[model samples]
Target: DITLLNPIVRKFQYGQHTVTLETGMMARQATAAVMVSMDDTAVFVTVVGQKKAKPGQDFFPLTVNYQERTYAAGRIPSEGETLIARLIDRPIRPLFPEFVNEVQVIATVVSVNPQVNPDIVAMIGASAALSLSGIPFNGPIGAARVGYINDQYVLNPTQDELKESKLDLVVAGTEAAVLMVESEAQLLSEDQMLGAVVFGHEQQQVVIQNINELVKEAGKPRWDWQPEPAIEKNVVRSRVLAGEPRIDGREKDMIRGLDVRTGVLPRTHGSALFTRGETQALVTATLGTERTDTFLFHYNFPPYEIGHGRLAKRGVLAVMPDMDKFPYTVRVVSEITESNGSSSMASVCGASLALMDAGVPIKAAVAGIAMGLVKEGDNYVVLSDILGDEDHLGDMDFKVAGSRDGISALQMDIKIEGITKEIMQVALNQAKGARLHILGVMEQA
Candidate 1:
């Protein structure tokens, strides 16, 4: 489902260019990629990384290979190769941690903004890319160009606007924080300088907020997040419980109570807060996005704020692409706010709630779970509602996802390949048991 506002966030008219920043769609292979368009001028910023540091590299290395691709404008600026690379790299290089060596950020000009400077578009693209790259980057650094003329600071001043202005400056930093400054002025007053910087930084926050939502809605999943090995379970895994006993002091099949509340956001058409155990999912549903099929997963803690916070987070932006041509367009946004475990599954459950709460006629509700298998040379143990750590030690990560009636996505991998019906039957039973237990909790809401 969609919202009343179009997906064009961070849109501002700069000279003849209508600058727009929208992410999570292009450059799927990159760690993070943001599409920045200023009028007909567009740029694609892609961030890529390798898990391990390059061998024998004596020093910490991070590369920003930026180019405007002479083809874009049919001509390159004077010394553009080196100048473009360094100008965009100024604020970004300092933001990465010392140990993050094998990362590369490249922003190539995709569209040409002839009215205003092209560098600002590239700068904004770089900031947006690094902020969402999951590379220990301390930025979503806002970047803007300012010009002073008639005592008024012009944002992203035009080539014509720059001629009349005595001061030219480019500023980039975190939200509400001044990190990097670039300026050229002829004895301008300190107050005047402060005013220009303040004006640009303030407007930058709104642009960053737009990026934050896209990051929250559909940013890339952090790749290094593998669950650790689990603690030993004191309880036994019997075919059936003989007495009142279960894992973690609960009944073997007794599911926890589900608590749900809808309409959490006043202006939001329908929103639901779903909480189960340590997992929490806040989902919202709205209308009109042209039957768009999207699945954006951004696990940022820091989803609630711009730079800093501590919490388990995984946001799900599901449009259920299979319903691409639905008459009643339904788009759901699900955020897993408190995920000690089972957060992905929680988003699935939350999406179902938001759809029903919004009164959209959904064909079938969907839910998902990660079934864990602890194996050591054929000694197999299946874990339901597995802890984040438990998932890491598993020989097979059996993630079974679907609704009550049918399966939407089923994926399983194993160190042990051949599957016997005996193993299949048991895994199926456990999956059904876990899914239904979760179902009962959700339906009560």
Candidate 2:
């Protein structure tokens, strides 16, 4: 049943099992394809990448998929596919050079040994495929499964052997460094656990060497790709808060003007129009049957809201009453009418008002605020209720949502590493004051 079509194959003994990598044998039309086998288990991985990225594609598009069938010792699945996909995704994701051309990695299990789990085998196949494909990946990562059995470490222990083992850990990385580790274990000494990691890393090196040899013999030429050059630099960011005014001419801690109105739509069960500076949202809450209880929030972002001309269509909880107390199904929709920045947080606040307007028994009204940080060396400034372009030039986007007493949700994105704890503390306190101010205005409305 196995026919070799110009096969470039590499096989090595790793731990207690033998691994084989064969490429150019099947999937001849794919950008690159490799079938990896350990013992009797096998995984086929293929990689395809766009030669050129689309203009204005600012984010890296790296998609990974893992599939297993009943024929591959798979009766059915759980979130197993997604879990393993992320397992293969996390390590190699950061290994790619600064290239954004779309790339996809797919791993399909073709055979399985009931004694062997296929997760690490699939990971090896993905790394081999990308390395051989000339996709400009800074990879070939090596993966190994480590198990603790009878007070000792066993490499790639079989499924039956795992029952006797106390630890099941998977480690994957390059020959020079370890990238990702995931494990579940019984109570063990820290040194023992750390030693297992070291052993796993040490054993995986031979596999990496084998892959390097394979690449030397059969790899394609590396892809030609480079990042776009920056056309504009932010001179204002250097001066701002260095005795310079904000982009919108507001104080560092000063929030944008706020307007809150509820019962704006008399016909709806509950409705509110929340306006914060140039960003505005019309939110409505609906009350439905108690037989099916659910609370959901839907956000819509239209192109016209941000003045792109064309129209296009696209959270609060805790204090929410239990189903026994308030059994009506509640749905809240936030429609952004005008947007500059922090429309997401605005929806959070708008939903709070709409629910209260609907006479839902929520314990307290919630509010949200967006905070930004601009840092240069030892100097830093945290601005409250950040404006649109301010986010484009800022280093951090920190959003806080909560009631007056405490916080419920937070979302933070940063462009720079090494953000000090002091900066976060200041942002949180500043957001609290801003949240209080917005809540006061909401109370008046």
Candidate 3:
């Protein structure tokens, strides 16, 4: 039987925007939508789900879709269906599991107001819908996109504001804990990233509770889930530390080798060769006009598909620049890959260093490193400066970037059910050492 329960709601005010929601918003029983506003901007979200579960389904079918009509946002959808679909998928898809099993959650932006960020509003709407649906979910999830500027977190900062910000963090979670987090740092540390997650969650608790209250008042019947039993992770801490010996006092070697012209590609504007024993990346940077910024992928059609014969239908793919047509000049490029293990972050570091080598006066130096984990009970192995193979086969991909004093970026993906604070803490500590080592190597290169 369906039940109408009071929802747990949460709210937060940052500058002129207010984000609110009802609990259990991403589950099958929650309401279909939520509301978000900022000054003159407004957005309404509608979340829906299928009534019957697909037989033999092994993953949560959580889908987040957004729509931006011209009238709602006071602007035409000039970007077209392809761009709109991609835009909705990029930020929203990352919030769901890679594979679906049980409930299917679909969130859409029914309306949008220009000044308002539909993405943020969609997050709130998704939560509210789930709460009202009466689904048994470990949510009312709350989300925020934090931009780091002048060493502080700015909520829902604009494109122009990003120029001053070095870190972009999108964090979300339940009232009692955090669930998901994604970020890019210029050169921040583990502590800073953790702190940012904590800060963002603290701000998110209010909305989480609000959604809970709403669900309490008018939610639907709860669904059942047979979650897999948690497996104990293997502890290889001692083995990792003993086997992959840490570099000792190699700052001079790193500094002497920091040059972009040694073996850089001729077509690229800037490049660098970075190496530390087995881990290495040949990073190249290209600077272009605003028109050159952006990536073009196939899937612009109404229904996107990929299969055996699908290769023939694909068209040209382009990676453009991001100039934003701003008065100040812009910088953007793509890095050709030869190795993995935080290649994107390596590209950022290599780009920064190459820019410096090419006589571009960057504000500061940037470097990144990835940490891995293999947990067994309370013990675990935190591998630093993970290699390409390690990342491919590892359980966790935890990457961090930044400068000496603080953190600027971080991204983490796990193959296990979930992780705890203690495990994350260990990973952070290991990452710090590896980061310093990488910095030393870059200085020499």
Candidate 4:
């Protein structure tokens, strides 16, 4: 046994057990590292990033590897590995500015209890490490596994209980919305599925809160981010007066320029290019019958493929993981050529642009925007259409996506302790403005 002068210890309520997260105790060489445990299960996560993408690398070079050694789990490492690793990576890959190259996350399952679940704890560790690592991850995600037994929701169910449950659901995202969901139910209804998603989100919020508090104490100073933009990261941050500061010399509520184009890919069913300042996505749509309708949403990061293809090679998708039971679905692929901010949101906008351009007569146009923040004490400022560097230097990375009618989906990750309802309202309102403006532009074209 060992002891430290200062140990970062945090506890979160996870069902019957308390999830404890501790840092500054080991693995000091990595950019950031943390160990999370609940009961007899333990997980350690570390994150390290390169300053730039490789010269020939066209895709976002972020991969998540979840490995459990035989010594930790006690012999007989078996087949459930690939799918579990893929599931762990799915929720995390989507929450970035896109193309902050050579970023890798490694999660090692240090200890295991057959009675306890290790996957979610591993993901939680990864989030805390990445958020605290100062690599501009756009995450500090929360994860929870849901089991339905007797029509009741179970959060992070135990291995024994899972045997009796019909639904095995995993939902992961940030504080605002869900990024990825995986579920397998024995003919569960739509409403039941929705309930599981909501419950997972609620339970995960506890973990996210615990993580934010932990990172606020143990996290590094966010790698200095290119600019001194944090309101006041000192011990007095919660007590300081507020101020509003926008990156790129724009109004707090104003967004960057809108550029939405269509028919850029002549061979595809439909295609468009969306440019909001330095961020751009060349999106293509292929109209098809039920057979050709592959339900996939693609997120291609910066300096990537021209008219990209080979999406199975990790182009990024938001297709409600495991939502394969549908009549038909559109296949939209977005390629990011340059990114100043919000490449995933650019994909959201470009997806609809290409869909409409193909003359599919889809619903209202789609648009997305990333909102950033500057907060200190009681004072705070929120910016619209965040630049990549701005996000790199800011406190919050909030994303909103959908048509002008309402919010189809959204996600958020906070760097500080938490965000104010006032700040949230501002982000939604500003994003609505940016969305409506972009949607209106698409309409004109």
Which candidate wins on lDDT?
Answer: 2
Top of the candidates by TM-score: 3
Candidate 1 global TM-score = 0.45
lDDT of each: 0.60, 0.75, 0.51, 0.68
Candidate 1 lDDT for residue 443: 71
TM-score of each: 0.45, 0.58, 0.65, 0.52
Expressed as tens digits, the lDDT of each residue in 45-158 for candidate 3 is 555555555664555556544455667655564233333333233323434434244344444454555445566556666666656655555557776667778888777677
Which RMSD does model 3 reach against the true structure?
Answer: 8.6
- For candidate 2, what is the lDDT? 0.75
Q: What overall lDDT, based on C-alpha atoms, would model 4 receive against the true structure?
A: 0.68
Candidate 4 per-residue lDDT, tens place, 1-445, comes to 5554566888777888889998887788788888889997998888888865557445677777788777787776333454566656767776665354677788888899988878888888888988888777675789888888877999888898988886677788788767665555443444465577778988898888888787788888765344222354442222222433334556555677788678887689889888878777888876555243355555566532221122121112322223343334567777778765346667777776776777655546666667776675656766677776566554566665556565544445554545635455665567777767777777787
The regions of model 2 sitting more than 4 angstroms off are 1-47, 52-100, 104-233, 290-293, 303-314
Candidate 2: C-alpha RMSD after superposition: 10.2
Error of 1 at 352 (Å): 70
lDDT tens per residue, model 1, 1-445:
6544333345655444566877655666678887888766777888887876656354557777677666787675523355556656766665655354577878888667576566777878887777677767754767777887887888877778887885666666667464544454433443455566567767667556766665666555544533223445433333223444344544433345667787777777667887877778788777664223332222333232210000011112222434445455555666667766435566666666677777765555555566665544455556666555445452455554455654443334343334333564466467766876776666776
Q: Give each model's clash number.
A: 6, 0, 88, 2
What RMSD does each model have against the real structure? 21.6, 10.2, 8.6, 10.8
Which prediction has more favorable TM-score, 2 or 4? Answer: 2
